[PDB]
Design a protein around this ligand. Structure first.
Ligand SMILES: Nc1nc2c(ncn2[C@H]2C[C@H](O)[C@@H](COP(=O)(O)OP(=O)(O)OP(=O)(O)O)O2)c(=O)[nH]1
Ligand code: SF4
Ligand SMILES: [Mg+2]
Ligand SMILES: [Zn+2]
Lengths: 435, 431, 381
DNA sequence: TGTCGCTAAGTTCACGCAGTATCCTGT
């Protein structure tokens, strides 16, 4: 507690309930954001590669936490200034990432998962004393049976907890919880119930704590997504938060079938126009070519398709090889800088070149007038209620939610189950459902 | 060279009021109480975020300015109803608006347009024909009430131009009835010669201050002029902040013997300060503990209370700005000063001159004149003067330095409740 | 009993025998929560199998009226909703939600058919009723010891089984997930008609299973070895052999060829299993598969479930769904339960005390004691 | 401080107009 410290950061672990109120610098903002992004990406990679209970997981996660200087171990010394600093980092960075990871359901889920993993690890590193301290500071009020009552139900406790030895059991203390909170334990009969209370040992507790945490965090993310318009106006923080998640730290014949079913409405419109006129302006060409690259159409397949489609537009075949062949090669990263250009994301399509008369690119939900969108939805035999819901979502400026509702209605699924943020993601989900 | 060998040192170039001795002496700020005029509106005392003006906000600020002044004038003149400026009028109607020029050049009698407010005219404009007006004095941004007719619906023909109504003077409390007369020395930048950065004129003025021991010293910017030939061509070997800090240290430390309350007013030509009007006070200098009570970093414009005497001051060259745009039917400076007092704003010109950056929300909040000041300090590139405009003593002390040659400052005596003769005497003197 | 005589007797009963005062005391729960009785769902089944739901009533007078007017053949009690069911059409979609209901269990003899030999389908006899007698003890003990539910009303279903209403305020606020957890915790015999071995206990016996086996043991010898005679002949003991590992099966068969009594055969089976240790729980698995209650988790999971009302009349047996006193459980006889015809004969043989002159009185008395306990709990709390 | 006029071909540059070629965008 050197100059401007306090009791604001009692314990290492926290539920991240109270937002920070300080005035920080832009440099500090960026440093904290990037550092926690690195930490969360490391958590995700280690979770994919190793089993979270494995010792390799623990060693690598400790190494990453030490490298990025985040709180991971307790200290029975006092609140040293350095420690305070670290905790402050953690607290601010978390909320910054919340602002970064609340725009799309997908993102939200990802964030939640990583956060939970990190929290679990940190809990796993808490000594019993520290653990109790934590459980008190957050008003979780998990105890604790007396020794006399424990002896009273000794045999019942012994037969309740799986793989608990007599002496080892004598060395352990249980907690009394209402059975409504131990559903997952009681349901398979792995914890003793007496008079409406379950007697839960000290490995499982993390689970309950995590449940609480997850609830809270989900709620918080919802609120943050509700408070997004206030932040978008701050240009300084827009490049970061809007793009933090992306921060560096098939047969031709079946295409038509996909156009009928799998293609998102943007690609459906583009394909319909192409087959209507056998020619697409540059924007349409770029968008559709990138999408067909995303689905998997190889350079030869795409070249054949484009040749066949354009030759019908009453143009010379050699004219095609003269002009559009170079464009195709570049679209596939064959010439020039030779870069594997990624397919357009729905956000880009919304914010890409604005279509004009004679154009058909862009997101229909954003670039189609409400009457035109209503007519198109009616044409596709969408139920009137579904069309009205889609129109309402479009009027709400949440075009991604409108496309998700379209997917739900067309695939006969109550919930999409994924945060649609890429047309290729739409096609992949449709293929997964169908095939 | 030229400045150091001048021969007219101490010459009184202009005088007003009671004759005084060849030497002036003050109380050294002993029985002196200097504060910011406590009005309804809070003063500008700290930086405000700027560089973000919405055109809608500018529209609202201008419209409310016109509306408020018109409401006050309507109550004063017992005018029944205002009429939309744009609508045709076969009979005589009273119209409230603001003057402007139909083109980007300088206003002339054939290029006058009247723009109404949102309440009465939806912001519509109308050309004005000044053929039937016998006497007038108009500048862009001037809120006016006119009686006239619009027979063609396309050209307003004024027949009467209502006069301005200045705010009432301040009625001082008796708390300062027994205080003695106070001496004020006011000087305006530039403080250094065009070809030097040594601040010789400032040193001479500080010597004068210590010699005469005034009660208040009002120093108006610029203190590090942006138009200084050395500054523009990047010949300075030290940062702007360092030069300004040296200048302020010189001023404050050098005035220690005099014990004189220093009132520092920034200028739009201060290369080291935020270029926005109303200008916030200087905040890069922390006076020592022995000078905190003596130094007052005030905002541009400022309304100061000195033992009940209200002094208005602005570093902006208002007279030069408005003289280039004022058109009259037939003293020009007196007319412009009366215009400033009657419009009740320290900068009523709209659009402003090319040399001033105006944040219109801050202008709305911090340019209203609370009352009509007893003394109004208006430094100008124009000639020095001491004028009596509607009972307010308007002092232009010139600038301390005029190119390569030394300039002038002013000294005046103020006492609350004297005789309305709150200004006992005033003199524009040479440095 | 003549079921063509049902339409003749139903009104009189609903007019002079159905205990409306105590019924309202029950479903009103001491008026503590406003709109509690007014938001309760009922459903009626009328003549010719006409079903109506979303019936709600303002108070006892309205209920008595509309019931005496309709003369329903079946009365089912449902959930307490966010609004009055009668106006569910008026409630905005998604805003009509079931919020509270008693925790209920239905045990039906028909679900025991693969393991009883005396009767089948809807037939019951004194030799098989002991199974219900076991269930009530096994379950009710858990509900009184493991979960701490204090107000439990057991009711005869009229023909094939028994219902339990657990009415503690805590038990009435349990979510769907909590109900499913409670049901799965109490449930041991898992599987359908396609599975032979329906109980696979682990090495460690959970205390609940130990106490259920202790309760089973007291009755097992009479029920299974004397009455049911689950080892009478080869066609039956082949099943029990089918429930144990093949290794000893042959060893058992010869032994079962030299045994004259099924008690002797049980002793032999226990001895052989003991001699053969991970299989030391196999006899317990057999006992459970022949004695432990079967619970339809769908009956108890859903909040919106409509269950037969107490003091209903069974459309076929005519018996009254009467409460069962837990203490006198061993004396309960589902064949002596008053029928509607008997109680109408009794009624037409002699205002608020008419029922005290019929054989229905002791069951209304048990119900009144249960309601008195509920009132004591509502006050004391 | 005055430094004669106009006329005309010619060089070098800055741009229209059209034609040819290569190189792009994203996550
Ligand atoms: N202003 C002016 N005009 C000139 C100049 N040189 C030639 N001219 C014009 C005006 C002359 O009358 C005209 C005739 O030019 P010529 O070269 O044939 O000479 P000119 O005829 O005066 O006499 P000449 O041919 O020698 O007998 O050209 C000159 O230097 N200045
Ligand atoms: S949200 Fe994406 S996939 Fe859906 S129509 Fe718009 S651009 Fe296409
Ligand atoms: Mg082209
Ligand atoms: Zn039977």
């Amino acid at each position: 507690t050197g100059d401007r410290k306090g009791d604001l950061y009692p314990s290492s672990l926290q539920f991240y309930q109270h937002p920070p109120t300080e005035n920080i610098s832009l440099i500090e903002f960026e440093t904290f954001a990037i550092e926690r992004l690195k930490l969360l990406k490391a958590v995700e990679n280690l979770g994919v590669s190793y089993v979270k209970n494995s010792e390799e997981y623990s060693k690598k996660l400790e190494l990453e936490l030490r490298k990025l200087k985040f709180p991971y171990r307790p200290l029975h010394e006092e609140i040293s200034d350095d420690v305070y600093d670290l905790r402050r980092k953690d607290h601010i960075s978390h909320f910054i990432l919340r602002l970064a990871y609340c725009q799309s359901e997908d993102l939200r889920r990802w964030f939640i998962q990583q956060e939970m993993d990190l929290f679990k690890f940190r809990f796993g590193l808490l000594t019993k004393e520290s653990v109790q301290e934590f459980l008190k500071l957050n008003d979780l009020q998990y105890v604790a049976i007396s020794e006399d009552e424990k002896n009273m139900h000794k045999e019942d406790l012994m037969n309740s907890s799986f793989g608990l030895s007599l002496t080892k059991m004598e060395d352990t203390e249980f907690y009394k919880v209402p059975f409504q909170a131990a559903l997952d334990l009681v349901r398979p009969r792995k914890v003793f119930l007496w008079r409406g209370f379950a007697f839960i040992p000290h490995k499982d507790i993390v689970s309950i704590v995590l449940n609480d945490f997850r609830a809270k965090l989900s709620k918080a993310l919802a609120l943050s997504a509700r408070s997004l318009p206030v932040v978008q106006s701050d240009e300084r923080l827009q490049p970061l938060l809007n793009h933090l998640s992306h921060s560096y730290i098939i047969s031709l014949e079946q295409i038509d079938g996909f156009a009928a079913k799998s293609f998102p409405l943007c690609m459906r419109q583009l394909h319909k126009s192409l087959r209507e006129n056998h020619h697409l302006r540059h924007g349409g060409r770029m968008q559709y070519g990138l999408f067909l690259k995303g689905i998997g159409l190889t350079l030869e397949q795409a070249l054949q398709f484009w040749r066949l489609e354009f030759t019908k537009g009453k143009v010379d075949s050699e004219k095609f090889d003269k002009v559009y062949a170079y464009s195709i090669r570049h679209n596939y990263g064959k010439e020039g800088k030779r870069t594997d250009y990624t397919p357009y994301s729905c956000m880009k399509v919304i914010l890409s070149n604005p279509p004009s008369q004679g154009d058909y690119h862009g997101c229909p939900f954003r670039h189609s007038d409400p009457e035109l969108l209503k007519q198109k939805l009616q044409s596709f035999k969408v139920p009137s209620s579904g069309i009205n819901q889609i129109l309402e979502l479009v009027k709400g400026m949440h075009y991604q939610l409108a496309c998700q509702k379209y997917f739900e209605l067309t695939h006969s699924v109550d919930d999409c189950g994924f945060s649609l943020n890429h047309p290729n993601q739409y096609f992949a989900e449709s293929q997964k459902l169908l095939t | 060279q030229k400045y150091g060998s001048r021969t007219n040192r101490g010459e009184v170039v202009t005088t007003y009021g009671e004759l005084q001795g060849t030497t002036w002496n003050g109380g050294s700020g002993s029985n002196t109480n200097v504060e910011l005029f406590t009005s309804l509106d809070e003063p500008l005392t700290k930086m405000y975020k700027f560089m973000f003006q919405k055109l809608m906000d500018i529209r609202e600020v201008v419209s409310i300015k016109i509306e408020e002044l018109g409401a006050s004038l309507k109550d004063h003149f017992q005018i029944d109803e205002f009429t939309s400026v744009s609508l045709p009028a076969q009979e005589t109607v009273t119209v409230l608006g603001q003057i402007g020029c139909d083109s980007n050049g300088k206003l002339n009698s054939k290029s006058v347009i009247l723009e109404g407010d949102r309440e009465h005219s939806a912001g519509m404009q109308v050309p004005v024909d000044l053929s039937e007006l016998k006497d007038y004095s108009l500048f862009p941004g001037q809120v006016v009430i006119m009686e006239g007719t619009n027979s063609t619906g396309r050209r307003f023909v004024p027949t009467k131009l209502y006069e301005g109504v200045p705010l009432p003077f301040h009625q001082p409390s008796k708390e300062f009835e027994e205080c003695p007369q106070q001496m004020v020395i006011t000087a305006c930048g530039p403080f250094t010669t065009s070809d030097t950065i040594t601040y010789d004129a400032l040193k001479d003025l500080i010597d004068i201050v210590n010699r005469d021991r005034p009660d208040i010293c009002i120093l108006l910017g610029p203190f590090l002029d942006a138009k200084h030939e050395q500054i523009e061509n990047l010949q300075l070997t030290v940062t702007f902040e360092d030069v300004f800090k040296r200048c302020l240290k010189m001023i404050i430390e050098g005035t220690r013997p005099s014990g004189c309350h220093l009132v520092i007013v920034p200028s739009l030509r201060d290369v080291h300060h935020d270029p926005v009007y109303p200008q916030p006070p200087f905040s890069c200098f922390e006076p020592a503990k022995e000078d905190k009570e003596r130094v007052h970093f005030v905002a541009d414009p400022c309304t100061l209370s000195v033992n009940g005497v209200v002094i208005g001051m602005t570093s902006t060259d208002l007279l030069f700005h408005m003289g280039a745009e004022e058109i009259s039917s037939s003293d020009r400076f007196s007319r412009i000063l009366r215009h400033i007092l009657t419009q009740r704003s320290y900068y009523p010109l709209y659009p402003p001159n090319e040399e001033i950056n105006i944040d219109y929300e801050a202008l709305y909040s911090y340019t209203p004149m609370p009352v009509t000041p007893d003394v109004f300090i208006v430094p100008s590139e124009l000639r020095y003067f001491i004028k009596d405009v509607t009972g307010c003593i308007c002092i232009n002390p010139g600038r301390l330095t005029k190119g390569l040659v030394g300039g002038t400052y002013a000294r005046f005596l103020v006492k609350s409740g004297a005789m309305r003769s709150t200004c006992i005497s005033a003199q524009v003197v040479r440095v | 009993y003549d079921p063509a005589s049902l339409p003749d007797v139903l009104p009189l009963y609903y007019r002079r025998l159905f205990p409306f005062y105590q019924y309202f005391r029950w479903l009103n729960y001491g008026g503590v929560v406003k709109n509690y009785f007014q938001h309760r769902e009922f459903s009626f089944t009328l003549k010719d199998d006409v079903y109506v739901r979303y019936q709600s009533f303002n108070n006892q007078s309205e209920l008595e009226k509309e019931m005496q007017k309709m003369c329903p053949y079946k009365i089912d009690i449902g959930a307490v909703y966010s609004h009055r069911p009668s106006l569910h059409n008026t409630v905005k979609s998604g805003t009509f939600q079931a919020q509270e209901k008693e925790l209920v269990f239905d045990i039906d003899m028909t679900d025991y058919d693969d393991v009883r030999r005396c009767c089948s389908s809807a037939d019951i006899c004194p030799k098989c009723w002991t199974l219900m007698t076991i269930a009530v003890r096994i379950l009710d003990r858990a509900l009184a010891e493991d979960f701490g539910f204090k107000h439990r009303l057991w009711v005869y279903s009229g023909r094939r089984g028994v219902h339990c209403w657990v009415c503690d305020d805590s038990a009435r606020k349990l979510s769907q997930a909590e109900r499913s957890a409670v049901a799965e915790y109490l449930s041991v015999v898992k599987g359908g008609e396609e599975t032979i071995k329906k109980v696979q206990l682990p090495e460690t016996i959970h205390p609940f299973i130990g106490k259920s086996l202790k309760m089973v043991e007291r009755y097992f010898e009479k029920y299974a070895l004397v009455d049911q005679d689950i080892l009478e002949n080869k066609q039956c003991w082949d099943k029990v052999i089918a429930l144990v590992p093949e290794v000893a099966r042959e060893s058992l068969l010869r032994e079962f060829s030299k045994a004259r009594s099924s008690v002797e055969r049980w002793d032999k089976l226990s001895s052989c299993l003991e001699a053969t240790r991970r299989y030391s729980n196999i006899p317990k698995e057999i006992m459970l598969q022949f004695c432990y209650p079967r619970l339809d988790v769908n009956v108890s999971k859903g909040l919106n479930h409509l269950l037969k009302s107490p003091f209903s009349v069974h459309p076929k047996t005519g018996r009254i769904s009467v409460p069962i006193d837990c203490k006198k459980l061993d004396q309960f006889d589902p064949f002596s339960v008053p029928t509607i015809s008997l109680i109408c004969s009794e009624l037409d043989n002699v205002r608020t005390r008419d029922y005290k002159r019929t054989s229905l009185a002791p069951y209304i008395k048990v119900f009144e004691q249960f309601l008195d306990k509920l009132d004591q709990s509502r006050k004391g709390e």
